[PDB]
Write an enzyme that holds these catalytic residues in place. Structure first.
Site, mmCIF file in Angstrom:
data_model
loop_
_atom_site.group_PDB
_atom_site.id
_atom_site.type_symbol
_atom_site.label_atom_id
_atom_site.label_comp_id
_atom_site.label_asym_id
_atom_site.label_seq_id
_atom_site.Cartn_x
_atom_site.Cartn_y
_atom_site.Cartn_z
ATOM 1 N N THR A 44 23.127 18.141 93.531
ATOM 2 C CA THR A 44 22.752 17.137 92.917
ATOM 3 C C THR A 44 23.095 15.980 91.901
ATOM 4 O O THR A 44 22.704 15.221 91.456
ATOM 5 C CB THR A 44 21.372 17.720 92.017
ATOM 6 O OG1 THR A 44 21.777 18.344 90.922
ATOM 7 C CG2 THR A 44 20.353 18.857 92.908
ATOM 8 N N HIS A 86 20.575 26.024 86.801
ATOM 9 C CA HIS A 86 21.423 26.253 88.447
ATOM 10 C C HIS A 86 22.312 27.222 88.134
ATOM 11 O O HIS A 86 23.647 26.911 87.599
ATOM 12 C CB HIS A 86 21.868 24.968 88.767
ATOM 13 C CG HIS A 86 20.903 24.089 88.964
ATOM 14 N ND1 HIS A 86 21.240 22.397 88.931
ATOM 15 C CD2 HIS A 86 19.453 24.239 89.437
ATOM 16 C CE1 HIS A 86 19.960 22.098 89.512
ATOM 17 N NE2 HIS A 86 19.017 22.931 89.576
ATOM 18 N N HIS A 105 19.868 21.179 83.508
ATOM 19 C CA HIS A 105 19.527 19.886 83.462
ATOM 20 C C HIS A 105 18.399 19.814 82.349
ATOM 21 O O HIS A 105 17.564 20.673 82.497
ATOM 22 C CB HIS A 105 19.194 19.432 85.224
ATOM 23 C CG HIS A 105 20.153 19.356 86.005
ATOM 24 N ND1 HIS A 105 21.225 18.389 86.125
ATOM 25 C CD2 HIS A 105 20.577 20.435 86.753
ATOM 26 C CE1 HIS A 105 21.828 18.634 86.918
ATOM 27 N NE2 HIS A 105 21.786 20.220 87.552
ATOM 28 N N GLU A 115 14.784 19.004 87.968
ATOM 29 C CA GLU A 115 15.299 18.292 89.262
ATOM 30 C C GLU A 115 14.277 18.530 90.227
ATOM 31 O O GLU A 115 13.567 17.681 90.648
ATOM 32 C CB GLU A 115 16.548 18.611 89.411
ATOM 33 C CG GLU A 115 17.577 18.256 88.362
ATOM 34 C CD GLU A 115 19.119 18.050 88.894
ATOM 35 O OE1 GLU A 115 19.514 18.826 89.557
ATOM 36 O OE2 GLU A 115 19.585 17.097 88.675
ATOM 37 N N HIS A 173 28.780 15.489 81.935
ATOM 38 C CA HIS A 173 27.100 15.473 82.711
ATOM 39 C C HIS A 173 26.237 16.612 82.226
ATOM 40 O O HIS A 173 25.048 16.506 82.264
ATOM 41 C CB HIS A 173 27.262 14.955 84.175
ATOM 42 C CG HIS A 173 28.040 15.835 84.841
ATOM 43 N ND1 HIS A 173 27.783 16.937 85.682
ATOM 44 C CD2 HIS A 173 29.577 15.824 85.139
ATOM 45 C CE1 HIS A 173 28.692 17.461 86.333
ATOM 46 N NE2 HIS A 173 29.871 16.794 86.042
HETATM 47 ZN ZN LIG Z 1 22.599 21.192 88.687
#
Ligand SMILES: [Zn+2]
Length: 257
Positions: free
Chosen positions: A195, A116, A93, A103, A61
């Site tokens: 998240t 992050h 992301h 995000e 991911h």
């Molecule tokens: Zn994240």
């Protein structure tokens, strides 16, 4: 089998992870006009001088840059936080296009990507225990915009060819995360969640006001990663972001006027 596709993306997560519709989900839109300046918020203390990076992993991911969190080597303190939070990993992301990928949003504006830096509260002893606590994690969120290159990101970009597919890892020692921080540490903060599944409501979010700039060539290299394993059908790892969730009964606080 959650992910970011049409059939398994954010709108479906609540079926396996009912907390997806909870009271303190992340990310959120940061309405800059309604955030409240809180003069009692302390400056952040970002202490990364002894950070020990270990490895970079494609987890299917995102990619995670992991750190030795068995001692207080790279820690976050101050700001809204009580106690000491140890850096465990960072990841990003990003989008398929420069106009999306973040995000969090700022007055509904989406950035090309969002970093992050994930930290856990040392009072809970390990990360797995910390995610079960309302004050278990502190995540430093930093927006990326496309413009000039970020030299401190290039060592990450260069190793991505070695971790193209899910489950691949590579040694990634002597990486300094200070090279990913903007000049200013002015921030917004609110209580929220992971998240990604399991979407646990364990995060104090600290979102920096100032974005960092990365080049087109750098973000393009993020987009050449794969969600799939080697020898599985190729699906580019892009648009691995969860959209903004309802703020519900939360106030976003600002460290700056
Ligand atoms: Zn994240």
């Amino acid at each position: 089998h959650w992910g970011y596709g049409k059939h398994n993306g954010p709108e479906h997560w609540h079926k396996d992870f009912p907390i997806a519709k909870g009271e303190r989900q992340s990310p959120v839109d940061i309405d800059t006009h309604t955030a409240k300046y809180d003069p009692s918020l302390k400056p952040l203390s970002v202490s990364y001088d002894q950070a020990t990076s270990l490895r970079i992993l494609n987890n299917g991911h995102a990619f995670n840059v992991e750190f030795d969190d068995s001692q207080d080597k790279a820690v976050l303190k101050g700001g809204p936080l009580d106690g000491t939070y140890r850096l465990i990993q960072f990841h990003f992301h990003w989008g398929s296009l420069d106009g999306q990928g973040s995000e969090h949003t700022v007055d509904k504006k989406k950035y090309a990507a969002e970093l992050h830096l994930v930290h856990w509260n040392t009072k809970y002893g390990d990360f797995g225990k910390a995610v079960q606590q309302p004050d278990g994690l502190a995540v430093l969120g930093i927006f990326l915009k496309v413009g000039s290159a970020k030299p401190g990101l290039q060592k990450v970009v260069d190793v991505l060819d070695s971790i193209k597919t899910k489950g691949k890892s590579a040694d990634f020692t002597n990486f300094d995360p200070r090279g990913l921080l903007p000049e200013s540490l002015d921030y917004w903060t609110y209580p929220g969640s992971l998240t990604t599944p399991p979407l646990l409501e364990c995060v104090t979010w600290i979102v920096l006001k100032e974005p960092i700039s990365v080049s087109s060539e750098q973000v393009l290299k993020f987009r050449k990663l794969n969600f799939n394993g080697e020898g599985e059908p190729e699906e580019l790892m892009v648009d691995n972001w969860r959209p903004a969730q309802p703020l519900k009964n939360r106030q976003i606080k600002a460290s700056f006027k």
